[PDB]
């Protein structure tokens, strides 16, 4: 249970290492809350930057403050866009969390309009609420600006351009910031040459905890060598691996592709042209003739694993073939030996 | 069944014992008349293995195709999700332990239906784990069925075309109704000796074998060997084989249109590639050529423009741009030239003289 | 007006006998549709079919598809359905109407929101309603246009229905104009065989034309007759333009009526007693009117005295002499037709047909100008004097088996000349005999009995209708004659002169300025030209900057 | 007896749950490891098994899952849910399919929950579950990816024991996931299957044909080991190896040669496998050409001449008809001369066979390789000397 | 001034006759040189008169076949606005008419040529209606291709009585709607200057127009500088050099197709001294 207790600490965690962002959001809600007014704040960032976690923290703190009467009471509501099949179910959620309970999306939206013509509403990943007419976004952002509406809106998504089609952004995590979170809870061990090794990344936090959690799995069955192995089992590109393990005729077919490309110089060629090249190579390697039924199989083996991008098999000799891997990568996979 | 004996040994031994397992999928290719399903149905009927047989062109949708397969086992069925559900739920002392066969005929039409349907069937054995064998047979090579993400590759079995000898042995000796089978043999040997190089379909050869048999043996009952001389010109009559009344100004519009089709562009000055097709007409050009060739010079009436509109409506003429029929017509003549010659012969005008060739 | 009571009388008598004779010309072909269909029903995966060739007439035959729905619901044999091709873009509407129509073919004779139909319930109606009939019904699926069938759709049904078959021995009738090659075009060879067709024939417009003229307009029943010019213009709209007996009929009403608004002088147009009633009703204005027209004025010119004024002043001796004009008149016309048919079996047999072929032709050319004065007639003479022998004795003996058949059945007269001819030809059956019969056909008939329209009795007007031109304005639809000749022959007149003059394309710099070299002054050419757009003698064209260029030639 | 057949048939055709695991020793450790961690402890993980098709995945996960549930605590406390992208094409179908496999059908339908996640969470809360997603590629293609996102979202933040194990053949899989789902996926836990060495292939060949401990089996295995080394079987196995490097393709080869074994042919021979190999090596499109009528052939030779004249430009029936007419012109008499409708019937039959493709007034291009044509002509049974001379004219 | 009235009077004698024709199921037609307004509106004041006379002017772009069937069905018919599918519309109006008999409705169309009436659906409507006996049709035509668009089925559905009807009157209210180009440098002189230049020169001019028109409502837009317009032209591949764009703007300025105004900054700003209506019309012609 020594280095095994370090397993238990990776999957979720607390408390935040985003110190400055937290304060900004707290003061935003506190400002709007103290005044008995509404507002909206859009939060950008990379998927791993601690946006929803920080918000949840700010909420728990504001509820504590609401118990001592430091800040006005009370209610809070959260809904996730990716948790719904059909965007319009949002109106049901919001209403169901408030009074009035169940109703259709049409009747709910009408009711929310009535209520809004204090409450904190978190809409996490409203990128999913995009619709042709975008009525729901227009409503969520219009509601807090009504006189009779006291509503504070916190909108999270991954892109800065969303509101362009009262704002904040979470930058990706740096060398030191990631290094911080890992040792931040290693307190079982107060092994730390690794925490900085894994810490060079782009830019998610989940990568760190999941990577190092795998490193411990390597150790048992932690040094820097264990983490290099951990990363090489994850971020390592599988394409070059597959080309090395591909069969004989599969490689000759790639050589055929590279031959046709070096002739034309384009990124597309037809199975017919590639076929002529493949015949030439099989002739020069002492191989048997590449029966077109075989070569079609091969070309599908390489298109099933996405080494190739191939037109549907119905087109027969007119298949147009693109490489899903850069020519330099293939030459390196074939020529390494 | 004859001349397929080799394919029967392969396909029979593959079936093995009925409580065994067989290929998850088998794919037979060949031509229309190869005899594929005749062999499949016999083997399934004779042994007798439980099976179902379904035509993929008859059932275009999932509901129809899947409901047929489910019903024929002895049932509202939308998606392949519920087939494995309700096929797996179909088990009894009849089907409990045994190999079940599903023959999808003309599977070539599965390609056009539902993306996940052909893959689901190739792997259907392990999807329901019910000891199934899906039998695909189509005239299309397996190389054209493969999808992007792939599939479980079936066993590709080739049913070869019948030779001229395989045809006679199948076609001849199995119905010598009123005579010695040697007489009917020499008959068929002559039948193929004509029609083989054109029609290799066993189905159609059986027709002609029945059709022309009476005339072949007619000299026998009338008291007159070597009848090859008798029917050969009659057979060759069938080999290479097996009056529209129009108004005057209409005929002239039509033949003018054809003359506009054949001769093109700046030849109108002198006058007034054939395998490629017919050219386009501006209505003005057609009226010009018409009044040029008419040599009666009748003024235009609504009925005449109605005549040309009626002509295009009858599909004797066709315009690429249907929408633009009054703004500039690009009409195109379809018929010709024999019909044009007939129009010329009846009218007495000559089509050939104006043809630039 | 009385002439409209006569209209509806004649009119619905006409479309009546037209639709009945449509039903008989059917009846050989329809008795051969149910005799063919009952020959194939007398004697797998193959749809037999029936191919009917109806040349290029649309609406006249929808009657007989209503009557195939009826008649082939009547034999107790099928329950018939008709699929139209334009109804029919997709593969769904044919199987939907397939079955809608054989569950429905079970309904109409007993005396949902139609989205509800699909490909199942036909297979059920000759299963569920009757799977065991036992004798299967045909459903002749009348494919009224198979030519416009969508070809993909076409083979998908002939293959789907063919595949399904012999549970449904469908036959399907083909409404068609052309010959078999075009079916063999739009219906592929696989279909040409799956159809197992036996080619059938249906009668076209031009036959119904010549028939109906021989019968109807040239009947002696109705007095109304037509002048050379609206006969020529009509049979020109029929032969040279539009082949529908529809447009010839509606044009024949419009002729009927058109005349029948001419003047009351036709109230005497009726049977001699029906006309003479009107004689009694005649008043002094009309007495003025008969005093006026020619062939009366001509009839007044070769004549007498106080006799002549009791035509002109004292009406009684006229109205007596009207019963003299008219009695004769309706005598003459009978004396013609009896004799016109006569001519036909003579010369309709003949070659060169220089004077004419079909009965309508002889009526036409005979009435146009003097047969005698025409030399093509004399040519026909030389012919008959040539043929002689047994061709003539057979055809002439058929002129009496058949024309004595007319005066035995078709015509009552009884004119006493007919009888003399008749005896003459009996005697022959038992050259200058052929030339005294033809000279009898010459002096005794063509000279005498066949004679012209204008050489005829008094009052050949109003029974024979002049004034062709206005109808041609009201039917032939010749706007560009009046337009062309009007715009040619004055600022828009001169404008169209310029629009004729300049070159081909006329630049609005030096068109506005050439029209200012050649010609308030501008606005009328932009309205001339904007009309010439609206009229269409030019177009507002972009082939060059600021240009106006004609599509019309 | 036929006892041989019953065994190899469940091994070759159906996929034998128990067999020898070749070269997966590393990958099995990582999978079985993770599986203990989610089942025995309260940990939640997600992993992808990624290889070519026909090798690896489904047997690995099947073998791993079996050994896992042989632990008494596991079999009682652990539920497993098997999903497949072919069967469930919609995340709503999948939801109701999870509800079905969890025996949670007693919800029952009275409460339709306000959100997709709320319904999924409500199911797990009614205690680990192992989610197997087969054909993971297709689950990535569902609209907004609700099933993947919310499974990973539940796998990470919900602390409900769950195991999300995907199977895919796509090296491109990771690029098919949304940024959000890619993050929540326990990052790039990846097992790769791929291939082996030729000597390992032969050892596999002999191991799959051999029979287990079940004197009849001992005599059988001696003969297999004899086959393992032969100049014939080896030069055939290599030819298949240079293509396959796959145990499923091998299974097919062993199966077809297994029909050759009967009560009159007790054990396989070199010829049994050579014949079985010949059936697989056939060129399908060459077989189809062999059965055409001489008319259709002459048309293809016309099309061949058209691609060699007009330089690979498409063509229509007319120009084919012309070039074909030039062929019969040689002799004044009519031998191959037929009516245009008939020639088009055969032409349309080539299209009906998809030996010609469109893009008469329609342009089309020939789908045959010239070496297929010249080889087929030499192998055609009755081919007349006249069409052969014409073929080489170009 | 004298003649026309007499002719507009003569046609009036056919009028009652047309009424009878209207009873018999045919529909009269006027092919004139001029307008029948005084004659068709005298047909409204003399013959039609009565009630149930529907008037839709086809030279009016305003009325539409859907709003033709509304304009018939909304006010005069009074039953309803015609339902979405016009075939269903006519099925309701007809199940009213087939049920309610002996209701004759006389409709007079000036210039069927339209649009909106160009649609084969529009004349399948007018084909059915004027085929439906209750109402009746008097159309006035101009377009030479008017007989063009009427097919067999429609000239059957329309049984047309065609009349000399050679009319001399304008074409005043018919002429009030049509606009022509004679009504700053006018459009056609602009086109005439620009047609002798290169394709890229015309492209440059169209780009500068576009900038002028998009900003025309902003008083603070004084135009583009040469460096800005030169970058914009480079990005559109209209000009690759300073020298060629400067030469092109000078050639424009000699024709009076650009004017420069010094900004506050001493920089020359490029405007076009042509009415923005004329420039708008130019861009609508060039595509
Ligand atoms: N500073 C941190 N300390 C501890 N854990 C962290 C930190 N930052 C991120 N995490 C990890 O990230 C998760 C919190 O989610 P996060 O706030 O990144 O959601 P999100 O950014 O809204 O999701 P997405 O951006 O993908 O929509 C936690 O479960 C934790 O494992
Ligand atoms: N050996 C044979 N003996 C007798 N008839 C045969 C033989 N082979 C084929 N036939 C004919 O072919 C028919 C069998 O159809 P066949 O087996 O060719 O269908 P199929 O090949 O499955 O059809 P398709 O290939 O068009 O799907 C029989 O009804 C018979 O007419
Ligand atoms: N390393 C191996 N160990 C055992 N069997 C193997 C191995 N590699 C391949 N096979 C055989 O190949 C077949 C592969 O089946 P499996 O479904 O497990 O993977 P797969 O075919 O790639 O799955 P998919 O359906 O995604 O293609 C099995 O029948 C198995 O017996
Ligand atoms: Mg979030
Ligand atoms: Mg698998």
XYZ file of C-alpha atoms and ligand atoms in Angstrom, chain A residues 10-18 45-55 124-125 156-158 170 173 177 181 184 204-206 209, chain D residues 149 156-157 179-181 183-184, ligand 1:
73
model
C -4.468 10.370 -9.448
C -7.934 9.916 -10.986
C -9.801 12.878 -9.393
C -8.184 15.430 -7.033
C -8.504 18.658 -5.007
C -7.834 21.527 -4.300
C -7.069 23.912 -7.170
C -3.633 25.166 -8.108
C -5.278 27.909 -10.185
C -9.428 27.343 -22.545
C -7.954 23.987 -23.518
C -9.973 20.953 -22.311
C -7.531 20.278 -19.443
C -7.152 23.717 -17.866
C -9.328 23.274 -14.771
C -12.233 25.472 -15.877
C -15.174 23.511 -14.470
C -13.184 22.444 -11.401
C -12.339 26.052 -10.541
C -15.991 27.044 -11.014
C -20.675 23.887 -19.174
C -19.648 23.422 -22.808
C -17.608 27.337 -20.390
C -16.251 26.197 -23.744
C -12.915 25.459 -25.390
C -7.639 29.734 -19.061
C -0.575 24.483 -18.211
C 2.243 24.420 -13.314
C -0.063 19.580 -9.455
C 0.922 18.967 -4.957
C -3.789 19.110 -20.551
C -3.697 18.311 -16.846
C -5.394 14.925 -17.260
C -2.222 12.269 -13.749
C -18.039 11.554 -23.851
C -13.123 9.873 -14.623
C -15.178 12.214 -12.443
C -10.781 17.356 -28.036
C -12.953 16.904 -24.936
C -13.454 13.150 -25.310
C -8.838 14.281 -22.923
C -11.273 12.234 -20.834
N -4.985 22.336 -10.754
C -5.497 21.089 -10.719
N -5.409 20.316 -9.617
C -5.919 19.071 -9.585
N -6.540 18.516 -10.643
C -6.686 19.171 -11.826
C -6.166 20.540 -11.913
N -6.435 20.993 -13.146
C -7.092 20.004 -13.801
N -7.271 18.922 -13.008
C -7.949 17.682 -13.477
O -9.002 18.129 -14.344
C -10.301 17.766 -13.861
C -11.158 19.008 -13.697
O -11.791 19.269 -14.927
P -11.576 20.612 -15.757
O -11.842 21.799 -14.864
O -10.324 20.520 -16.601
O -12.870 20.410 -16.673
P -13.110 21.288 -17.983
O -11.835 22.048 -18.280
O -14.427 22.013 -17.823
O -13.358 20.093 -19.033
P -13.287 20.429 -20.596
O -12.359 21.616 -20.642
O -12.734 19.168 -21.215
O -14.704 20.778 -20.971
C -10.091 17.080 -12.520
O -10.800 15.836 -12.451
C -8.606 16.894 -12.350
O -8.285 15.507 -12.507
